[PDB]
Design a protein around this ligand. Structure first.
Ligand SMILES: [Zn+2]
Ligand SMILES: [Zn+2]
Ligand SMILES: [Zn+2]
Lengths: 210, 96, 48, 170, 125, 49, 481, 48, 147
């Protein structure tokens, strides 16, 4: 345990998040998408010695939707339970980098003030929080998962316009959903849910985030 | 004799109870199938069963040949009479 | 007591007593179930 | 090739290993010295661990158990004659050594019995009477249901396991 | 030291205190380096007869061959066998059965008790 | 039982049961117990004439 | 369409309920028009093509002024249009159906007319219809005996009690279950599947122990347990400097080699487990598996110094004898050597030749069945089960809808409840319309919240005051209103 | 042993219930579709 | 937790009118049989089986917190109610319950207390066999066990 297999987890979670970022539209390199565990150890020169800062090594920037806002950032805290101290240093790093988005992946628990500070952060800036064990398996790989697409405000505008649909009338979607957390979807935003239909052949629905 | 081989993933008793059940089912089915053959097409009963009315072959088995095993929740009748069902039976009896 | 709250609407969309949308259309086609029938598509034919 | 080490504990393990190879005179008949073989085994454990780990000591200990066996002297002898090199003997690949005479047999049959524990699972059925038009094979199952029901006639339902087909007596 | 021996040390379940018939309790004499047995309510104490003072996880033996007086043999509803010669007395009428308990014994194997006077023996084949 | 059979013991009331398994003999003469008449078989034969 | 259709139906069953039986309609034209195989089949194929293209336009269910509505139009009609396109092929008309253009032309008018007919009435109280549509099959033999064998344990207790519980949305199923699929070789290798079986399966320490005993041992090496005496005595590389003060009392446990056969275990795994849990404070030693019996004898790490009545604190920090029992009480009951801590023990084996699943495509384009090893388990740690190696996270499911919400969310819930209701329905064998089941899942999920649609959740609902008061509470909703 | 009717004329086949109704592929369902409830009800009363 | 690692061997009698349950062995102290040997005979005439001995042993550990019959009676009484500090009354009440309210069916006479004690041990013994598993579980559906 924590001797070799751990690298596989760190590899698989790295690919899962990269695919997630890739799914977010960020131009992850195919090789990063394609790399093997053997290559993953090779890419990081992994395991010259034990308990090495792989989580510091795993820490990465990801960047590229086709809309060049650029610069999303992913950080992996070394401490299982993350404190405000690491959050301030992180806050300093994201500020100094002036990144647009920061994703922090915590191993275990957190102080509620850090949890609070993460929630509020800044009215004009976003910080993202992901638990490592939940990342350990890509839920979107599951067969029961429909295709989810975030809708542009104009698409939402067009959607309401075409139907004369009232905002209330739209089914709500709870932001407590892991998948909601996956898209990084915000409240009030709409996600396009694409489903197979045993009747239509194809069924599309939408839900506003609550 | 304890020379009986238990079914993998099951106890010997589970095998034994299962094994006796296949036999009581195969025989009844065989003897039933004999009765399905034994009846003329002239019969009202076969006429009633074939037409899709309220009847079947199992009925024929029950009326003509054999009702079959009675069970409790699918299990053979429990030994409510102290390792027996009735005082007419010998102790440790396992007859159907 | 649960299902009494829902009915079909004239815009084909399925809605409740407070007019909120359940479905884009009833059964995702808006057609009557009685007019449906068992059929073989047979396009899943073995050999291409 | 005697491998000398500077660590007293390693030498002490080597002495303990040399002592384990002293079992039952086989080293005499083979003519190989227990101390050199004992020294080569410990070095080999060390070549992998490179530290006086308890687990490193544990390998000596697992090695001790294999040396101190009396039911497989031919194991020691296979090692002594160089057929099982000390670097090989140390250097794993035997799965709790017990080759020659019985524990291996036991190990095989144990592998059989635990393999048998999936075999059937817990049930059976099958009738093999009705043909299935999707696969010609009569791999079918049959249902006895609708004891009374409503106006629908009691039917015998037949399902084909493979390729999933189900149809009725009617 | 061989895989052919057995472990029947004859555990000592209890010894009553001669002062009160209460149970004696283990204790060390760290000064004499010896195990002792004492009662709590009184000052009565005595040395131990063995180093073993405890046993656990129990019931991997043939209980059903025990705890069965042959007097069951008087029950007519228990079937005699035509199988002869009590394991002792050269006479048949052995009474037979499974274990027939909580340890219902997946062992459906017959166990034999002769009913012939002057033996009382409980065996199986 | 012979006293029971002699009617010097009330068969209609007195129940008498022995369990070798428990090494016990239980007897009950309380009200509300159900009993029924049976033919008494002796030497695998009926006692009646 | 044929290529697309393989995606839509992994079961490979092409027999589906659909509107307008064109075959019977086409056949009727033949019965009417008197077309026969010994008569020529005069046809214009482009007219067929256009007729299908035009009829496709006639398939209006929404406006076609914008492409999205058309996309809405296109996908909603997609499956029917494929049945239509597959059936109305030019070759089919001329060869199989031998239809004349006139026969084809009259038929088109008929099909459209059938299409106009298929439309349901707007304003319909279909919901009351659906409630009755669920209620009626519930009346049948949903509770009639556990007829199911299927080479396995009788899981997901059949029918109404699960249906009642489901309606009640109990936090946990009365009978939780989970189906373990196996990727690659595990599907074909029992030995690999057993290796997974060993890894997944719950194992308590009490499950592992053959016997335990407590001994008074004057010397750790000159032990009174003479059988183990060389075994202790031979060890010397162990720091026996701090053992000159460790518990003079000996505690020894006997281990079930049968269990070691049973779960495929080793001594080194056990010793390392015990020390990691109890810490350095517990001394642990054991004989080799090749011995006469597996025994493990333990000591408390009395670290020489202050652990010797240093402060006399009149409390007796811990007596030895009792402490061997507290550890042993704790040793058996607390430690799980292997497995998920709520899955009981958890496996049953089934051969995939069980059902129509894992039907796979081939070079020919024909569907074929794939056989496999599978375990059906009682358990719901969906994160942990998803996290397990070699198990397929895609197909692996559990009977607990709650975990689906918690992990995958309400959208996956909508599907799993849908599958499960259908599954109860599939057991009774009485067909029920699917659209209703699709509709039912939408009703419970329309809020995006998992909650009892019953009276147990009405107060959270935004429903009207007269509704909530109608739920027998009356005055309480009305006073607040 | 097999059922077949053409132009309202029965060629062969002993009848069953799956033919006679409350099932898929039944004469009753298609008559309802073609002949409609009114013609089908009069046929049904008549046959009985 | 770390208290005694083995609470699951504590039976715990349910006495009439008492506000809570108390160990069977406490009653035995109230019966005045302070000697464990005497209680064991009351439990079984044949303690030669170590298995029966080990199963009862954890109840014996309970017995030592109170040895005196008088304290035991006041204890049971204290569990019965709170007649102030007057622990004559709790004892006296316990005495009345022990005679009349406990197993009336054998007799409420004082000298039939020792006699009463003999029934309880078989009752526990019968429980003990079934709890050990040597006894089969009694049927509720059986009519012979019914009136
Ligand atoms: Zn088939
Ligand atoms: Zn004493
Ligand atoms: Zn004899």
């Amino acid at each position: 345990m924590d001797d070799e297999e751990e690298t596989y987890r760190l590899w698989k979670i790295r690919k899962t998040i990269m695919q997630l970022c890739h799914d977010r539209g960020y131009l992850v390199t195919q090789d990063e998408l394609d790399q093997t565990l053997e290559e993953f150890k090779a890419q990081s020169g992994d395991k010259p010695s034990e308990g090495r800062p792989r989580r510091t090594d795993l820490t990465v920037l990801v960047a590229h939707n086709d809309d060049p806002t650029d610069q999303m950032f992913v950080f992996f805290p070394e401490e299982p339970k993350v404190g405000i101290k690491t959050i301030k240093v992180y806050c300093q790093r994201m500020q100094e980098e002036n990144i647009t988005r920061a994703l922090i992946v915590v191993q275990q628990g957190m102080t509620p003030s850090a949890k609070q500070s993460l929630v509020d952060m800044a009215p004009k800036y976003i910080l993202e929080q992901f638990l490592q064990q939940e990342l350990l398996i890509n839920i979107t790989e599951h067969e029961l998962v429909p295709e989810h697409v975030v809708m542009t405000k104009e698409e939402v505008t067009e959607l309401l316009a075409r139907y004369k649909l009232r905002e209330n009338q739209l089914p709500r979607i709870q932001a407590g959903d892991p998948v909601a957390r996956y898209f990084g979807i915000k409240r009030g935003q709409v996600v396009k849910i694409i489903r197979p239909s045993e009747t239509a052949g194809r069924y599309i629905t939408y839900r506003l985030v609550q | 004799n304890n020379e009986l081989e238990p079914t993998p993933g099951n106890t010997l008793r589970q095998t034994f109870e299962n094994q006796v059940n296949r036999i009581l089912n195969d025989a009844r089915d065989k003897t039933g199938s004999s009765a399905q053959k034994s009846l003329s097409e002239y019969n009202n009963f076969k006429s009633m069963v074939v037409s899709g009315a309220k009847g079947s072959k199992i009925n024929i088995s029950q009326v003509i040949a054999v009702v079959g095993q009675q069970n409790v929740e699918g299990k053979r009748i429990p030994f409510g009479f102290k390792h027996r069902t009735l005082p007419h039976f010998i102790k440790d009896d396992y007859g159907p | 007591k649960s299902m009494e709250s829902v009915m079909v609407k004239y815009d084909a969309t399925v809605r409740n007593s407070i007019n909120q949308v359940v479905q884009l259309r009833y059964g995702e086609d808006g057609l009557a179930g009685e007019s449906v029938e068992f059929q073989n598509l047979a396009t899943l034919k073995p050999s291409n | 090739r005697a491998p000398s080490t500077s660590d007293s504990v390693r030498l002490k393990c080597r002495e303990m290993l040399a002592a384990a190879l002293r079992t039952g005179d086989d080293y005499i008949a083979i003519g190989a010295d227990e101390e050199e073989l004992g020294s080569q085994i410990e070095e080999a454990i060390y070549q992998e661990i490179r530290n006086t780990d308890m687990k490193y000591k544990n390998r000596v200990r697992s090695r001790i158990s294999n040396l101190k066996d009396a039911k497989n002297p031919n194991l020691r002898k296979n090692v002594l004659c160089g057929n099982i090199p000390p670097d090989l003997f140390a250097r794993m690949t035997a799965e709790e050594m017990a080759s020659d005479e019985l524990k291996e047999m036991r190990k095989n049959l144990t592998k059989e019995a635990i393999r048998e524990h999936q075999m059937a699972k817990t049930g059976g059925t099958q009738t093999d009477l009705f043909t299935c038009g999707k696969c010609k094979k009569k791999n079918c199952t049959y249902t006895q249901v609708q004891t009374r029901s409503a106006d629908e006639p009691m039917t015998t339902f037949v399902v084909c396991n493979e390729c999933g087909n189900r149809w009725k007596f009617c | 030291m061989e895989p052919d021996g057995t472990y029947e040390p004859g555990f000592v379940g209890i010894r009553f205190c001669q002062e009160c018939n209460n149970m004696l309790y283990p204790k060390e004499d760290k000064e004499n380096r010896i195990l002792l047995y004492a009662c709590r309510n009184c000052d009565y104490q005595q040395e131990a007869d063995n180093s073993c003072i405890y046993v656990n996880k129990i019931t991997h033996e043939v209980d059903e061959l025990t705890q069965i007086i042959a007097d069951v043999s008087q029950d007519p509803t228990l079937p005699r066998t035509e199988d002869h010669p009590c394991q002792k007395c050269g006479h048949k009428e052995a009474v037979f059965f499974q274990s027939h308990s909580a340890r219902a014994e997946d062992a459906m194997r017959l166990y034999y008790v002769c009913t012939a006077p002057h033996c009382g023996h409980r065996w199986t084949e | 039982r012979k006293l029971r059979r002699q009617m010097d013991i009330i068969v209609s009331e007195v129940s008498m049961i022995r369990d070798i398994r428990e090494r016990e003999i239980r007897i009950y003469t309380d009200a509300g117990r159900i009993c029924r008449p049976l033919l008494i078989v002796e030497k695998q034969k009926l006692l009646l004439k | 369409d044929r290529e697309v259709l393989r995606v839509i139906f992994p079961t490979g069953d092409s027999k589906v309920v659909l509107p307008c039986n064109l075959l019977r309609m086409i056949w009727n034209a033949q019965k009417i028009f008197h077309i026969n195989p010994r008569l020529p089949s005069d046809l214009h194929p482009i007219k067929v093509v256009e007729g299908v293209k035009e009829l496709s336009k006639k398939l209006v269910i929404v406006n076609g002024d914008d492409p999205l509505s058309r996309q809405a139009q296109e996908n909603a009609t997609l499956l029917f249009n494929i049945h239509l396109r597959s059936t109305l092929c030019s070759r089919r008309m001329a060869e199989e159906f031998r239809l004349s253009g006139e026969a084809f032309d009259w038929l088109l008018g008929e099909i459209e007319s059938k299409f106009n007919q298929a439309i349901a009435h707007p304003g319909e109280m279909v919901g009351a219809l659906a409630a009755q549509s669920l209620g009626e099959p519930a009346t049948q033999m949903t509770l009639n005996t556990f007829h199911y064998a299927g080479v396995s344990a009788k899981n997901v207790t059949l029918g109404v009690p699960r249906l009642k519980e489901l309606i009640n949305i109990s936090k946990k199923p009365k009978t939780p279950s989970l189906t373990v699929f196996l990727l690659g070789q595990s599907a074909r290798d029992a030995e690999r599947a057993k290796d997974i079986l060993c890894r997944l399966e719950h194992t308590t320490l009490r499950k592992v122990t053959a016997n335990t005993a407590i001994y008074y041992d004057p010397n750790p090496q000159s032990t009174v347990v003479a059988e183990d005496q060389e075994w202790v005595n031979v060890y010397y590389e162990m720091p026996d400097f701090d053992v000159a003060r460790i518990s003079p009392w000996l505690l020894r446990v006997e281990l079930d080699r049968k269990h070691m056969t049973d779960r495929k275990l080793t001594m080194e795994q056990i010793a390392e487990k015990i020390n990691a849990g109890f810490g350095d404070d517990l001394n642990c030693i054991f004989n080799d598996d090749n011995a006469e019996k597996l025994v493990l004898r333990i000591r408390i790490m009395n670290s020489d110094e202050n652990k010797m009545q240093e402060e006399e604190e009149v409390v007796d920090k811990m007596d030895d004898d009792v402490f061997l029992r507290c550890i042993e009480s704790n040793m058996l009951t607390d430690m799980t050597l292997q497995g998920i801590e709520q899955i009981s023990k958890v496996y049953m084996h089934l051969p995939q030749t069980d059902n129509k699943k894992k039907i796979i495509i081939t070079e020919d384009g024909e569907f074929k069945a794939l056989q496999e090893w599978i375990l059906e388990t009682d358990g719901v740690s969906l994160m942990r089960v998803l996290s397990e190696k070699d198990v397929d996270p895609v197909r692996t499911t559990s009977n607990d809808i709650v975990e689906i919400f918690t992990v995958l969310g309400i959208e996956a819930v909508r599907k799993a409840l849908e599958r499960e209701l259908y599954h109860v329905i599939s057991f009774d064998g009485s067909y029920v319309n699917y659209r209703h089941l699709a509709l039912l899942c939408d009703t419970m999920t329309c809020r995006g919240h998992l909650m009892a649609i019953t009276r147990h959740g009405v107060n959270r609902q935004d429903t009207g005051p007269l509704m909530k008061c109608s739920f027998e509470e009356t005055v309480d909703v009305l006073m607040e209103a | 042993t097999k059922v077949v009717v053409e132009n309202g004329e029965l060629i062969m086949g002993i009848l069953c219930k799956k033919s006679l109704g409350t099932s898929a592929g039944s004469l009753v369902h298609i008559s309802y579709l073609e002949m409609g409830h009114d013609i089908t009800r009069l046929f049904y009363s008549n046959i009985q | 937790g770390a208290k005694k690692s083995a609470i699951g061997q504590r039976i715990v009698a349910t006495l009439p009118y008492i506000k809570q349950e108390v160990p069977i062995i406490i009653v035995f102290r109230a019966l005045g049989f302070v000697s464990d040997r005497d209680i064991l005979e009351h439990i079984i005439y044949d303690f030669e089986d170590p298995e029966m001995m080990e199963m009862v042993k954890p109840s014996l550990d309970e017995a030592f917190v109170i040895q005196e019959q008088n304290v035991a009676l006041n204890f049971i009484g204290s569990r019965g109610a709170k007649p102030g500090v007057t622990k004559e009354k709790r004892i006296k009440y316990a005495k009345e319950v022990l005679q009349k309210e406990m197993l009336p069916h054998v007799g409420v006479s004082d000298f039939c207390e020792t006699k009463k004690a003999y029934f309880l041990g078989y009752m526990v013994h019968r429980l003990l066999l079934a709890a050990l598993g040597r006894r089969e579980l009694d049927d509720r559906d059986h009519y012979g066990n019914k009136r």
